[PDB]
Design a protein around this ligand. Structure first.
Ligand SMILES: *Cc1cc2c(cc1C)nc1c(=O)[nH]c(=O)nc-1n2C[C@H](O)[C@H](O)[C@H](O)COP(=O)(O)OP(=O)(O)OC[C@H]1O[C@@H](n2cnc3c(N)ncnc32)[C@H](O)[C@@H]1O
Ligand SMILES: CCCCCCCCCCCCCCCCCC(=O)OC[C@H](COP(=O)(O)OCCN)OC(=O)CCCCCCCCCCCCCCCCC
Ligand code: HEM
Ligand SMILES: CCCCCCCCCCCO[C@@H]1O[C@H](CO)[C@@H](O[C@H]2O[C@H](CO)[C@@H](O)[C@H](O)[C@H]2O)[C@H](O)[C@H]1O
Ligand SMILES: O=C([O-])CC(=O)C(=O)O
Ligand code: SF4
Ligand code: F3S
Ligand code: FES
Ligand SMILES: [K+]
Ligand SMILES: [K+]
Lengths: 102, 139, 240, 611
């Protein structure tokens, strides 16, 4: 769109706010719904966030393209592994509780 | 008789090939609490993301599942004050980043931009980070 | 009988081949000097080292000429009181992360070109009535310009902002963005939507991450950080 | 040793204050390929510091008439003003201010939405009979700040070619016509010759000939010096305006708008003494009268402060919301430079050198004139406007808020006159291949000067001399000693000493050039003063206390012998300098009394001048 930059800025704040609502959700209604929402929200927020760091600090067409490509790989693998953990293992909410029972 | 784009082009053309130095910046600039808190927000965000990504790699690559590693850790009978310190260390950056993240979202609504309020809200962020971390690590 | 204050001042001569930037310490008797740092700079130039080079004109903080980094913060030398703690040496640097023409004189022409790029002047759709009658503007709409039109374009704010340090080629910086907002909310101006449309890219506006060094440093007490956040809100709510 | 770069334009404008900017893009707007040469980035010019506002008979606060403003100005000039230029300036004022508001100038506003206007010194309704006028248009107390930023913003829409931080050295003259300017590029040390069919000089004033002034450090009379070095006359340089209220110590200006909004001057015994000196106008009398009254109180023992050397400007009886809305700038400046909270305590103030009434003589169209065998003769290709010009719309004493008006009216006039006289693209005139060599020879000499008197030391001696000998009140013997000392200083310039041997941003060198310039202005100012054996406007001779016109206008003219031109003083001073020796020659030229249209605006005959 001709408004791609402002729509992206708005999407970032929305996902930040979404992630903020998922923390009460995880404490109060832990389960598959929250687990996968955290997988999605944590990956998207971190991806957009790391994208801002790249935009600030990486300069030059090729280093920019390289950093962003590696970021896509990192994000895609991160989301895959969190969904993997949620499906084959105890999932995010239960793992945290188990960690905190140590 | 020169457009803005041409002026910027000539600036970079002129200066990068010149013998002029770049005046110092980060090495000489005075710090403030908002400035320190701003970059700590970035550093905790990045650290949280690297932690989430490492956790995600461990789920794909480690030959045992999570309850095994929890059971292992308990078998070391670590001291309660050392357990508390690891819990506090884990939750502090999440805590900092969350509260300051809320502060950022208030700014994006246009509120709290008076410099004295920027200072108030930063200190408020720090005390909430401390209280919430100490309280959570005691759970 | 005298109060010797020490200043450590950044020096670089372009007419010395191979000259390297260095700090030079001068000693000034505060009893025989005005109260402001520019007063000390002028006293040094006139009495100790006439090769010391800096920009100045108004000496009352209205022209913006003498912006520099005094004790770690960007300010106007002519309104910045001298620190009378004689056990501290005041360090003086050019505005940070700028090309140094000579000593304390930075190259501001990129800063000026960015200001030119936002078209800092009144624009009406029908300008065929240009000069017949005064445009009407209520006291209430004129009040919206307070805190904005007072900027002196000293570049203290923009050269204190780390986002401008790392991306000053493409980020307009706080001084220029606040002037862009000054024209966006001028009720006489008809180009608000076009002025917002200019900032629809990753850099011009959106390198600002609300660090707020700019507002802290402004010798005029303005709030370019707040103006940037109002722009961001307008960016997200305007239609076409 | 110096690489010379040659340029050809239709028009070169020297100066980027209010006058030069308006002149420069008016020319580009008229289709002329125009260069603007300025030693400062344009918004650093002294115009940025202007405060109280700009006069125009808009009638936003009460019914007004531009002819009332004409009358005020003519009476303000004490009949050394050229009334044709004053007619032009005051009739053009509404259109000119409206042009500025339409550019985006953020004027303060009335309940009706129109430009708010305040009272100011020496302005009245009904040709002096109808009470205080309110025609000073303003942006709080930052009017010059906004005027210049608006003009600079507007200039960016045109193809004007700017040469920023270039220092103009001299005019290029050939057979009495100006062919352009030669200048030094401060950024890289290169010499530049700007050939042009028309050259406009808008270089500001020279308040820095004195020790205390409201002027920027950069008000060094550079264009005035260039005219002088061209063998051309300057006019009325002895008429220096002391603004009543420069802040004590730093010398910063505290706007006359403070008194226009209600502030009052009080002495050590609490007396609002202007009620005694000017029973009608009080603190809003003309500046020459207020400055003189303040000076008398101090030297007669009623001065304030521990040294009894200033007086108080009191604003705290005024509602604090009015102070915040009408006078924010001086509210902050009074705290910074005097630790004064204006809502609680008065501002320490004393008369401070502020503005030069004299300058480069022009006609009402902006054209520089010379004067030969009793006849004004336009100098072809040469214009002047703003504080550097002597049009003369101010004569012997300027009204507050009339300079910014002058700037944009006569800056535009220069553009209009060139456009009705020349066409763009006409052959730019040739200059001899070594034109301007003597400017470079002088610059090089200063750059390597190794005498015994450094520049700061000579500049201070000039400033203290002017301060002690050519002040608010003058007398013959003191002026003569000021003349002798100043000529001595000028000869001692042979012993000048510089240290910076570079060429890139050598402000040591640049400030030595400015000292040469200031000295030529100061030499003409004080020798003019010593020879003017009368009292008129801001020039007060305690040995010649009366205004001396061609008649005694205090009595009926019926049966009076007109005084010969040589035996009265209602005439402009014309000053020349033999730059080699520093010798000052003087001549005189009549004041223009005709208006542009007698039926539209009567010529005002000289009269008793009281406020
Ligand atoms: C000192 C002052 C004057 C003043 C005022 C407040 C102060 C502190 N408030 C005023 C007000 O409220 N209303 C009003 O009518 N007048 C007021 N004044 C007087 C007025 O501001 C000045 O007379 C006026 O602004 C002068 O403007 P002008 O356009 O004539 O000149 P300038 O602003 O001083 O700028 C001079 C320009 O010339 C260039 N220059 C000078 N020398 C050179 C050389 N050698 N080479 C190239 N360029 C040169 C300067 O760069 C500057 O741009
Ligand atoms: C950083 C590491 C995560 C820190 C999270 C701290 C929160 C721990 C906690 O207190 O959860 C306890 C909760 C209830 O379990 P319990 O303690 O038994 O209490 C029962 C009665 N309340 O157990 C739960 O229901 C869990 C609900 C909260 C889930 C939090 C999800 C977001 C975590 C994002 C962390 C990302 C960063 C990871 C960095 C390290 C990676 C190795
Ligand atoms: C778990 C979380 C992770 C892994 C994470 C990660 C990140 C990262 C990498 C950034 C980029 C830092 C920067 O650009 O300066 C960021 C920024 C941000 N985060 Fe988080 N974050 C988490 C939780 C939260 C929460 C709970 C909130 C509320 C939040 C609010 C924000 C905001 C508002 C920003 C934007 C900062 C700016 O625009 O300057 N984050 N986060
Ligand atoms: C997770 C923890 C991350 C944040 C904590 C890290 C430690 C922070 C260190 C930086 C603090 O640095 C310190 O900040 C304070 C408050 O802004 C500054 O003080 C500032 O405000 C005060 C009061 O309005 C002024 O008097 C002072 O002139 C000004 O510099 C001080 O000059 C700076 O030296
Ligand atoms: O000089 C003028 O015209 C006005 C001025 O300095 C002031 O604001 O008092
Ligand atoms: S906002 Fe403040 S610091 Fe920035 S240029 Fe304007 S006056 Fe200078
Ligand atoms: S310091 Fe820079 S990041 Fe934004 S709030 Fe100010 S422009
Ligand atoms: S000299 Fe004008 S801002 Fe300091
Ligand atoms: K608008
Ligand atoms: K003048």
């Amino acid at each position: 769109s001709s408004k791609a930059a402002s729509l992206h800025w708005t999407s970032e704040r929305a996902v930040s706010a979404l992630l903020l609502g998922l923390l009460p959700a995880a404490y109060l209604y832990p389960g598959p719904a929250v687990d996968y929402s955290l997988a999605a929200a944590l990956t998207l927020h971190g991806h957009w966030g790391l994208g801002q760091v790249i935009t600030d600090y990486v300069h030059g067409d090729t280093p920019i393209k390289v950093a962003n490509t590696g970021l896509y790989v990192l994000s895609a693998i991160t989301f895959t592994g969190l969904c993997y953990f949620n499906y084959y293992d105890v999932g995010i909410c239960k793992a945290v509780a188990m960690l905190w029972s140590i | 008789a020169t457009t803005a784009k041409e002026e910027m082009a000539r600036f970079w053309e002129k200066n990068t090939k010149s013998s002029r130095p770049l005046s110092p910046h980060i090495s000489i600039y005075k710090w403030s609490l908002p400035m320190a808190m701003s970059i700590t927000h970035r550093g905790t965000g990045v650290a949280l993301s690297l932690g989430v990504s490492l956790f995600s790699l461990a789920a794909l690559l480690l030959p045992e599942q999570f309850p095994h590693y929890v059971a292992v850790v308990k078998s070391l009978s670590l001291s309660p004050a050392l357990i508390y310190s690891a819990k506090f260390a884990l939750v502090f950056p999440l805590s900092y980043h969350t509260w300051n993240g809320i502060r950022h979202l208030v700014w994006d609504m246009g509120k709290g931009f008076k410099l004295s309020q920027v200072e108030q809200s930063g200190v408020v962020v720090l005390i909430l980070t401390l209280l919430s971390s100490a309280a959570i690590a005691a759970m | 009988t005298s109060r010797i204050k020490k200043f450590s001042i950044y020096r670089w001569d372009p007419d010395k081949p191979g000259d390297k930037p260095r700090m030079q310490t001068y000693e000034v008797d505060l009893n025989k000097c005005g109260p402001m740092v520019l007063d000390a700079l002028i006293k040094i130039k006139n009495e100790l080292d006439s090769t010391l080079t800096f920009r100045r004109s108004c000496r009352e903080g209205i022209c913006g000429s003498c912006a520099m980094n005094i004790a770690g913060g960007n300010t106007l030398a002519c309104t910045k009181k001298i620190d009378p703690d004689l056990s501290k040496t005041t360090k003086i640097y050019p505005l940070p992360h700028m090309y140094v023409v000579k000593d304390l004189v930075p190259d501001l022409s990129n800063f000026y070109a960015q200001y030119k790029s936002i078209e800092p002047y009144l624009k009406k759709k029908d300008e065929s009535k240009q000069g017949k009658e005064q445009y009407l503007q209520s006291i209430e709409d004129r009040q919206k310009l307070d805190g904005l039109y007072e900027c002196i374009l000293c570049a203290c704010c923009s050269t204190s902002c780390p986002s401008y340090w790392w991306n000053g080629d493409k980020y307009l910086g706080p001084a220029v963005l606040m002037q862009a907002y000054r024209w966006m909310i001028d009720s006489r101006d008809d180009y608000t939507e076009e002025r917002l449309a200019q900032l629809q890219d990753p850099f011009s506006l959106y390198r600002c991450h609300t660090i707020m060094n700019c507002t802290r440093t402004c010798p005029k007490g303005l709030n370019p950080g707040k103006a940037i956040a109002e722009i961001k809100k307008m960016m997200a709510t305007y239609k076409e | 040793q110096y690489p010379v770069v040659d340029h050809e334009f239709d028009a070169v404008v020297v100066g980027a204050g209010g006058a030069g900017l308006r002149a420069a893009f008016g020319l580009s707007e008229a289709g002329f390929n125009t260069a603007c040469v300025t030693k400062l980035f344009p918004t650093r010019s002294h115009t940025v510091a202007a405060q109280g506002g700009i006069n125009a008979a808009l009638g936003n606060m009460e019914d007004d008439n531009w002819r009332w403003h004409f009358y005020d100005t003519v009476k303000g000039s004490d009949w050394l003003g050229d009334q044709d230029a004053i007619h032009y300036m005051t009739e053009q004022a509404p259109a000119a201010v409206i042009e500025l508001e339409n550019y985006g100038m953020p004027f303060s506003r009335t309940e009706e939405g129109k430009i708010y206007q305040r009272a100011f010194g020496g302005q009245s309704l009904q040709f002096g009979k109808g009470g205080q006028a309110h025609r000073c248009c303003c942006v709080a107390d930052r009017t010059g700040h906004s005027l210049l930023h608006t003009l600079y913003g507007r200039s960016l829409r045109y193809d004007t070619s700017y040469f920023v931080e270039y220092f103009a050295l001299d005019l290029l003259m050939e057979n009495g016509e100006c062919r352009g300017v030669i200048a030094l590029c401060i950024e890289d040390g290169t010499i530049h010759r700007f050939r042009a069919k028309n050259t406009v000089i808008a270089t500001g004033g020279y308040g820095r000939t004195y020790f205390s002034c409201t002027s920027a450090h950069t008000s060094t009379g550079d264009g005035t010096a260039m005219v002088t070095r061209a063998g051309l006359p300057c006019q009325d340089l002895e008429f220096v305006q002391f603004h009543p209220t420069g802040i004590y110590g730093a010398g910063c200006l505290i706007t006359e708008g403070c008194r226009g909004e209600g502030g009052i001057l009080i002495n050590s015994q609490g007396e609002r003494f202007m009620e005694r000196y000017a029973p009608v106008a009080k603190d809003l009398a003309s500046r020459d009268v207020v400055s003189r009254s303040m000076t008398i109180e101090i030297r007669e023992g009623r001065g304030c402060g521990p040294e009894k050397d200033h007086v108080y400007l009191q604003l705290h009886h005024l509602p604090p919301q009015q102070l915040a809305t009408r006078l924010p700038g001086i509210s902050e400046t009074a705290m910074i430079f005097a630790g004064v909270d204006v809502t609680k305590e008065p501002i320490p103030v004393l008369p401070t050198v502020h503005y030069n009434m004299g300058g480069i003589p022009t006609n009402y169209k902006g054209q520089v004139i010379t004067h030969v065998n009793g006849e004004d003769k336009v100098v072809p290709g040469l214009y002047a406007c703003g504080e550097a010009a002597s049009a003369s719309v101010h004569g012997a004493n300027r009204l507050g808020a009339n300079s910014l008006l002058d700037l944009v009216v006569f800056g535009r006039a220069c553009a209009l006159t060139i456009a009705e006289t020349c066409k763009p693209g006409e052959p730019v005139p040739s200059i001899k291949p070594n034109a301007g060599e003597e400017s470079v020879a002088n610059l090089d000499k200063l750059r390597f000067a190794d005498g015994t008197i450094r520049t700061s030391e000579a500049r201070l001696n000039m400033q203290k001399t002017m301060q002690s000998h050519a002040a608010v009140f003058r007398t013959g013997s003191i002026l003569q000693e000021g003349c002798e000392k100043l000529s001595q200083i000028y000869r001692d310039l042979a012993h000048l000493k510089t240290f910076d041997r570079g060429i890139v941003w050598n402000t040591d060198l640049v400030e030595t050039l400015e000292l040469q310039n200031l000295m030529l202005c100061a030499l003409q100012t004080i020798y003019g003063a010593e020879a003017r054996k009368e009292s008129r406007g801001a020039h007060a001779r305690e040995d010649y206390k009366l205004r001396i016109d061609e008649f005694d206008y205090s009595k009926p003219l019926q049966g009076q012998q007109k005084r010969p031109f040589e035996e009265h003083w209602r005439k402009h001073t014309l000053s020349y300098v033999d730059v080699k020796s520093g010798k000052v020659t003087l001549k005189y030229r009549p004041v223009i009394d005709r208006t542009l249209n007698e039926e539209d605006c009567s010529s005002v005959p000289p009269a008793i001048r009281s406020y």
